[PDB]
Design a protein around this ligand. Structure first.
Ligand SMILES: CS(=O)(=O)N[C@@H]1CCOc2ccccc21
Lengths: 178, 245
């Protein structure tokens, strides 16, 4: 098996920690959802190729501009996350997260991931966003942002239901192999 | 880690670690607070274990088996003895607080009601100055350590055999040299996330809410100072490149 490194980036409310927890346990924890994620090395076989994919989170480093880049050396694939219940998390992608990752991880594929897709049809979410003249991120808004920033691709998932989670990490593995 | 502490922190949560008849005696809010305190101690136990892999398995193994040039092992594992002393002492205080809280006749049933004062002590005074100095040095030497590791692995056969040998066991899967270095750099930024969630469930006693609020502020002050004191060292960097920063 070949070793590859994945790092997830995005704003504090984007759901990156929950996404790594659910994938690494293959389950949304029923008793206690951890606050933090240390690291994990997943055994993934994609399109007949076996990879050891090391997973890292940048949660807690969003306010520390000199500590945060220490997570980037030798990254093979970036997951750049936003939450579908937070159009504000999508606005910070093009001119904050994107130029940073392009500087520290040149030529590394970026997959833009819309997290919490289950909230797109949640009435409480729609009511809360409507007070700030907002609505959940639309699929075309996510695709257009991924297109604009030069992302390798655009994907959506829900850590809560597990829908789309396995597909995100299998595609990240394929991107890291290219 | 030692077996006694590993077993005490084997469960996925405090609610699964204690006896069910003890859990049933507590309110939901206390259970939520105890689950996050348990995660802080459990991850601190693992962080000390990562430092012991660096000092005992890698560093000492390289000094005892390999013929590396002097100053090479210190370059791979900067500040590891100082980091081990800081975190082993902090872990000792956390585990003693849990041990004193155990019910008589039990080695698993406890409630920690007063964590805030312990966190204020850790993140203030001489111990905070030592954490700040040690992480500013470690994090500024992080990139150099990774490059030195990569260079030795690519060019030295005996170094490559040593690494492959000691990292082969399944229990070292997440703990190669580069993975340990990043686990240590990321440890300090996990503390505000854990303390904020403990504080969210510690409003029942106003003195405790105030102490955890003070601790959260001290940890953020420490992180800001460490972040401001980092400048990556690079082997062979010239003075002109440094003063033109
Ligand atoms: C200054 S920062 O830490 O907040 N990140 C910025 C975002 C904007 O663009 C870039 C480009 C390179 C490097 C860092 C950055």
């Amino acid at each position: 098996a070949i070793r590859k490194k994945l790092v997830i980036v995005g704003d504090g409310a984007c759901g990156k920690t929950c996404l790594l927890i659910v994938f690494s346990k293959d389950q949304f924890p029923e008793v206690y959802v951890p606050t933090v994620f240390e690291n994990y090395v997943a055994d993934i076989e994609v399109d007949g190729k076996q990879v050891e994919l090391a997973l890292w989170d940048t949660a807690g480093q969003e306010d520390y501009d000199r500590l945060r880049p220490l997570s980037y050396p030798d990254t093979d694939v970036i997951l750049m996350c936003f939450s579908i219940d937070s159009p504000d998390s999508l606005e910070n992608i093009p001119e904050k997260w994107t130029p940073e990752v392009k500087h520290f991880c040149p030529n590394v594929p970026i997959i833009l991931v819309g997290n919490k897709k289950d909230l797109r049809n949640d009435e409480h979410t729609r009511r809360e966003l409507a007070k700030m003249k907002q609505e959940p991120v639309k699929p075309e808004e996510g695709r257009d942002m991924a297109n604009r920033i030069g992302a390798f691709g655009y994907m959506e998932c829900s850590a809560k239901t597990k829908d789309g989670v396995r597909e995100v990490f299998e595609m990240a593995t394929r991107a890291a192999l290219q | 880690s030692m077996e006694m502490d590993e077993k005490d922190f084997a469960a996925d949560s405090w609610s699964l670690a204690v006896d069910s008849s003890f859990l049933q005696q507590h309110k939901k809010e206390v259970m939520k607070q105890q689950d996050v305190i348990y995660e802080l101690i459990q991850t601190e136990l693992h962080h000390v274990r990562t430092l012991k892999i660096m000092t005992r398995l890698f560093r000492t193994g390289m000094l005892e088996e390999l013929h590396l040039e002097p100053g090479v092992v210190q370059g791979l594992f900067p500040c590891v003895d100082e980091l081990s002393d800081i975190h082993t002492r902090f872990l000792s205080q956390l585990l003693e607080r849990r041990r004193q809280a155990l019910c008589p006749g039990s080695t698993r049933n406890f409630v920690i009601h007063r964590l805030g004062d312990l966190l204020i002590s850790q993140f203030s005074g001489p111990s905070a100055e030592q954490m700040c100095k040690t992480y500013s040095e470690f994090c500024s030497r992080h990139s150099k350590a990774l490059k030195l590791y990569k260079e030795l692995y690519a060019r030295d056969k005996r170094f490559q055999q040593f690494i492959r040998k000691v990292t082969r066991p399944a229990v070292l899967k997440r703990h190669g040299v580069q993975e340990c270095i990043l686990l240590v750099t990321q440890r300090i930024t996990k503390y505000p996330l854990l303390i904020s969630r403990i504080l969210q469930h510690s409003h029942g006693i106003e003195e405790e809410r105030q102490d955890l609020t003070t601790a959260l502020g001290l940890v953020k002050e420490l992180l800001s100072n460490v972040d401001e004191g980092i400048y990556q060292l690079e082997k062979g960097a010239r003075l002109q490149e440094i003063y033109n920063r």
